[PDB]
């Protein structure tokens, strides 16, 4: 016959590998696909959907509802912290559990803008204005409203507007940066920071809630897929 | 170049008014009308068969209101399912009992108001095959505790201990996963500060063209809030929920006896 | 950028584990049996049960391939010489006959897909297309088995692809050997629909989706951070 | 020579393969094939030909003819049940062993249309009307005439014509029901309803017997081969 | 709905077996024979019989393959180191010469196709087209064998295929190691003709038809159903 | 794309009156004949050789008339055997002698009448190659017992236990079988309420072009009772069933001295 | 002979021999002209063929009578749809059936009295 | 052996309220009475088979009929 | 290299096959064939030749 030669490879299984095999039910008739609503193409599709960010996680908050209310209420002095944490989506324990974060621990690399959308579920006769600052990594994270006002930031007003949108850019040393993070690859820090105060009429309750999402913009973009260092089992589900 | 004829043996490929029958709902400000996965529920077509599907249009897509419920501040989230809150509801019921195969769509409409002193936030969402998790492990559960006839199964805080019931742990949603997460299906956010409603259009999701309405809830709805309702002493204090959900394009076939047995 | 490891086909076309099958040469033990049988189910291994159920229905087309291993018993000689052994594995359809035990002449089947492999070549591999009654796969099956709401809650009744029955073809050796077959499954032509959010609480069973009360995140010391 | 690779899959037999192979005997003259009349190039059209249903199966009448007669009778009480059997063609212990049923047991999915002729084997001034009739499956078998009326039926009497035809239609929610049936897919039940009445004049036997025939219509399909679990061996036959 | 599975070609056309051989490297008792003989029938096995009967004529040409396992016989000692056995079929067509025992000069054959087969290599197959001085397969002949309607009544005048001979071709073990070949056959371009009813009696022997009286069906309790 | 030269190394393909010579049969009422799988009994071509194939056309293609049977209670079913029962049967059993191989085909006539007070249903079916088995098992029976000269072989309705007889219960059909399924032959219903007749028309059914007709029954017509015959015992009492076949376009070769042993 | 098919039902045995319809005017859906909503029409789940209790002819029988659409009431979807709505339109097709042999004797009248 | 009556929608109405008001009855009477000789069958049943035709309906509110 | 898959049947040695094998002595220049009277082609054309039978073979 034809004179063959064996190369390097042969008889090997590599689990990724994409060769052809024989049927073992052959001439098989499938039922014919038909209209079944929302089908999903793509994964990062599923990170454009927003989803409300665990922002008090401060334990014992998250075996309850409260980890993802973030309170705010009139102050005595303008220009402090309402809540603040690590760029590092799929490795910082605030939005790792999130939407973003589960798909994106299913990767090794991940590339693209990422949007920020406050919701105030305060009372509608109350206003106030909060300043939303992004700071590049740089050296290092901002500790007060004087230094974070030096990058990127919005300034949101809840009496004209009950959502804004933080759409926080790409702007980095690499192209990719690695999901679980080290020194090398920084993504920055997120604050916000009373730009005046909270100022209700009287009859209204002190405390209020700001609810947080998180989700993907169409730069995103992921790399070598893994496992996911979430699930651990030891022997088989019976 | 493939090598043979089945393709299982292939490579990989590398103010506002909406009107149903004699029915109407208000108040609607020209707000938001979420519509499912981006599809309109209509009618089957005929490259799905299978006799003759009957279609009541008028005396069965029309809006029925189920019972009110009280929104407490210790209030962790309630759930409905569906076509299993709609057993006693007028024609619609009737024609379930006495048909083996059904199909519907739906336009569900939650509504809750409060003043301008009030503060909250609701999140309406319908998950469709939400298969819950027991709250007793290693003991299956009893229908009454998924779903009554029409009454409104309400989550808890904590976890529970019940032997046959589902478990009610709101911040998983009784089903295995964070309640945060729950964007993706169909849904929208109650605001008391700028919204007072929620209307969502759902189609018809499942796997097959028909199905038996009683032996499958063919998707749930679920009201959790997120900000609790916090309100001045002095203020009213009943703020009631309503659910006004109405059928859409509803199909059935294999008309016998009257079920469910 | 192109998302070329996020679609689909990509995400879910990777041979991952889903059953290990144990079995003997000596019936040394009730459970190795001789010879042992596998339900299909994918709801055994976590991390295929977690690609599978972001997705409500699936459509995927299948590629089963096994890397038997075999291991001598320990006992107090070990010297022999044996010819190689043969593996048997049939895909029983849903309904079908079984072996009742070994020795059976259902093993000797005339429509059953059956594949043999000596040990020391190529693990052999065979597709199955697509094995149901509806038009797509359902993950999660919101209902009962029965008309009047009892029975069977959960995605059990809908999963209903067959067995998989392993043997050994040789009738004897010298001294007895375990043999460990490793069941690899890898979706191809994947059409997925109505994407479910992603399991927190690590499974419990296998026939249910129950779980164990969890936390949404992992806790952290202040709501602030605070550093010049 | 060319330099190959081999995957994995090779060195092994899979029993439903589709491999060439090398010839004992080659260049054999085969004698030529003839005209014979019946050839048969699909098992569904063996499917389609009729066979007559041992409904009368309660035993010890299984050992007999008297399996396939259905014994009917004057009465004095309008509405009353013949006969009735659950439609689960291969599994239902009635028309499981017949022509259909025995095709369809090499196979473990079935859809389509099934067909059954009645014929009634009494005297020819016989006479009456029966009520045949299908309940689809729901909840759940009819227990009376009024009850099994609600569904599809037809009312054949048998003055008029010797042999009638209920068509049974493909009402499911699936696209394939199991052969070897379950809860998850029922198919229904067919059952039988006097009437009126067998009058007959003077000098007339007072029992009489309907046969029942069974077969497919032309939307048939089976899937999913596999073993027959009827006959079973020990050792080779000598 | 295209009625794939159930063609004669998708229902015959799949590998089932049909004789098990055994014979041995040592002349222990009489029945291995150091080798063995068959001659070719298709009524030793209930799966493959069944789906002939189906029809009075046929037509298929034929794939024949075999899974030979070997394994040491029971002894007091096992450990040897021998070179790997090969194996030999020897198709003796009807009326040729036989061999008549073991070291006999007929398996060094000039006409009668041999294969030859060395453990651990993939199982040998040969080809064998359609084998009649007829223009099709009789699964069923209704009359004798003589012109007086004496001798011999049924079918196995007309089933005339030949002997299918298995040996060893290494002369000798140091320990001796029973063979085991299991024949299977694969119709293929089959047409059929004259649809027979399926039997309902299990089989007695292979020559004949013979049966034993059944049932027509399992019984049941009443001839009505009855519930709400 | 094929390897190989031979086609064994391929992969798979994936009123009224009938007048025959000085003969008629009636009642017909235009009612049903039945032919054959499709086929009308035709010459043979010339693509199937092998000298001069003799066809006596008139003189042997005549309606031969059995002897007739009784219609009792109590009977299982008779069956005969062609083409041995049409031996001593004028100049076709003449030409069976002095030839070697022979070809016909046939056209049977079962005809059984009764009254309007009458019921009971016969089946009269065709059956090709009906190989039977035996009443005790390793014990082969003798050619006498399968079928006599033109005598009518009845069937029994509880096991044989003969030791050189053909096994004969009815629910078996003699064959292996169940004898409800014996609807895919060529056959017709005779109803007593309907029919009173049976005319099947068979063709040339073998593996072969021609055979010799002494030593390979060519089909076998059963004629089983399903529904038994029950009358008045005022009425008639004697039901006979008579059997009339003829042969059509019946050729012949190897003419030598008179056969048969 | 002659088969009469209403949604899922069918009667027999008809030999082609009469159909009375009315008088004269075959039951239609109502025009524009006579209003009054929009009007249910539940064409397939309702127009069948129901069969009530059969009742016995015996010699001292004067005669039976049944009032619709009160015979009617628990007959399936027909009488769902009674309740649950305020006025009503139907017409009907009323198969009396009674069958015996060919010596027998006696004759009925099957009438439709309106109001 | 039978009789079939098709029967349209009678009354001085479009359309009225199917409770209160039977719009039209079915006699069935026996004109020349049922005999048989004493050894033929006894039972004869009449059966009554009914269908609506073109039914509409208005005024959809509680199920009634109070 | 090309991803190949070893079908059933290879590695045997079925004396009735039909392949190829490399030569032993390659560029061999074979002597010329010439005309040789009798050339058989058939075995057939054998059995057509006559041949007297023994038919008076009752021993001695």
């Given amino acids: 016959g034809l004179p ?3 190369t390097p490879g042969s008889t090997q299984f590599l689990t990724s590998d994409d060769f052809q095999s024989p049927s073992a039910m052959p001439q098989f008739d ?10 999903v193409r793509n994964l990062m599709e599923i990170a454009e959907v927003d989803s409300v960010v665990p922002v008090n996680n401060t334990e014992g908050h998250v075996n309850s509802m409260e980890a993802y209310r973030i309170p705010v209420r009139p102050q005595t002095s303008s220009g402090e912290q309402v809540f603040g944490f690590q760029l590092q989506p799929g490795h910082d324990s605030v939005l790792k559990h999130t939407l973003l974060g589960e798909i994106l621990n299913y990767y090794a690399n991940w590339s693209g803008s990422m949007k920020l959308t406050f919701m105030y579920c305060g009372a509608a006769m109350a206003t106030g204005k909060f300043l939303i600052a992004y700071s590049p990594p740089g050296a290092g ?6 230094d974070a006002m030096l990058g990127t930031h919005v300034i949101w007003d809840v009496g004209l507007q009950s959502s804004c949108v933080l759409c926080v850019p790409w702007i980095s040393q690499t192209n990719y940066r690695y999901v679980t993070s080290d020194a090398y690859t920084d993504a920055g820090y997120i604050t916000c920071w009373y730009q005046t105060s909270i100022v209700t009429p009287p009859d209204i309750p002190t405390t209020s809630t700001i609810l947080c999402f998180v989700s993907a913009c169409n730069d995103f973009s992921v790399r070598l897929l893994r496992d996911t260092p979430f699930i651990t089992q030891q022997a088989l589900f019976q | 170049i493939n090598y043979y004829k089945d393709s299982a043996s292939n490579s990989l490929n590398r ?64 759930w409905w399912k569906f076509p299993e809150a709609l057993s006693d509801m007028g024609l619609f019921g009737q024609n379930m009992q006495y048909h083996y195969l059904g199909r519907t769509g739906y336009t569900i409409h939650v509504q809750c108001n409060a003043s301008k002193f009030h503060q909250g936030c609701l999140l309406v969402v319908c998950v469709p095959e939400a298969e819950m998790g027991a709250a007793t492990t290693d003991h299956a559960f009893n229908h009454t505790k998924l779903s009554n006839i029409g009454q409104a199964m309400e989550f808890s805080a904590k976890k529970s201990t019940d032997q046959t019931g589902p478990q009610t742990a709101v911040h998983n949603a009784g089903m295995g996963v964070a309640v945060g997460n729950l964007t993706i299906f169909p849904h929208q956010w109650i605001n008391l500060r700028t919204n007072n409603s929620a209307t969502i ?3 018809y999701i499942n796997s097959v063209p028909m199905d038996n309405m009683y032996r499958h809830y063919n998707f749930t709805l679920m009201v959790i809030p997120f900000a609790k309702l916090e309100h001045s002493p002095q203020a009213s204090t009943y703020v009631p929920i309503t659910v006004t959900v109405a059928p859409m394009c509803a199909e059935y076939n294999g008309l016998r006896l009257a079920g469910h047995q | 950028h192109t998302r070329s490891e996020s679609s689909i086909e990509n995400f879910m076309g990777r041979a ?16 190795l049996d001789r010879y042992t049988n596998w339900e299909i189910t994918t709801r055994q291994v976590a991390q295929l049960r977690r690609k599978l159920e972001m997705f409500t229905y699936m459509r995927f087309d299948l590629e089963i391939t096994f890397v038997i291993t075999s291991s001598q018993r320990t006992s107090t000689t070990y010297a022999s010489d044996s010819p190689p052994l043969t593996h048997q594995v049939m895909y029983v359809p849903p309904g079908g006959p079984i072996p009742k035990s070994y020795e059976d002449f259902a093993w000797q089947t005339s429509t059953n897909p059956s594949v043999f492999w000596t040990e020391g070549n190529a693990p052999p591999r065979m597709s199955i297309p697509f094995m149901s009654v509806g038009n797509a796969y359902c993950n999660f099956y919101d209902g009962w088995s029965h008309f ?20 050994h073809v040789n009738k004897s050796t010298a001294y007895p050997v375990n043999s460990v077959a490793r069941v690899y499954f890898k979706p191809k032509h994947v059409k997925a629909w109505v994407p479910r959010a992603p399991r927190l609480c690590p499974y419990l069973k296998a026939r249910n989706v129950n779980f164990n009360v969890q936390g949404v995140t992992e806790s952290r010391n202040k709501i602030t951070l605070d550093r010049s």
């Fill in chain 1, 4 to 6: 063959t030669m064996n």
């Fill in chain 1, 30 to 39: 499938v039922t014919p696909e038909i209209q079944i609503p929302g089908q």
């Fill in chain 1, 141 to 146: 994270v901002p500790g007060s409203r004087r």
């Fill in chain 2, 15 to 78: 103010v506002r008014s909406i009107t149903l029958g004699n029915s109407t709902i208000t108040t609607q400000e020209c707000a938001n009308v979420v519509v499912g996965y981006g599809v309109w529920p209509t009618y089957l077509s005929d490259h799905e068969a299978t006799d003759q599907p009957t279609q009541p249009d008028v005396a069965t897509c029309r809006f029925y209101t189920l019972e009110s419920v009280k929104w407490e501040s210790s209030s962790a989230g309630w």
């Fill in chain 2, 201 to 203: 259009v759902m189609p």
């Fill in chain 3, 16 to 31: 991952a584990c889903v059953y290990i099958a144990q079995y003997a040469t000596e019936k040394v033990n009730d459970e």
């Fill in chain 3, 148 to 167: 009047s709401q009892s029975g069977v809650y959960g995605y059990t009744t809908l999963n209903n692809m067959g067995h998989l029955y392993f043997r």
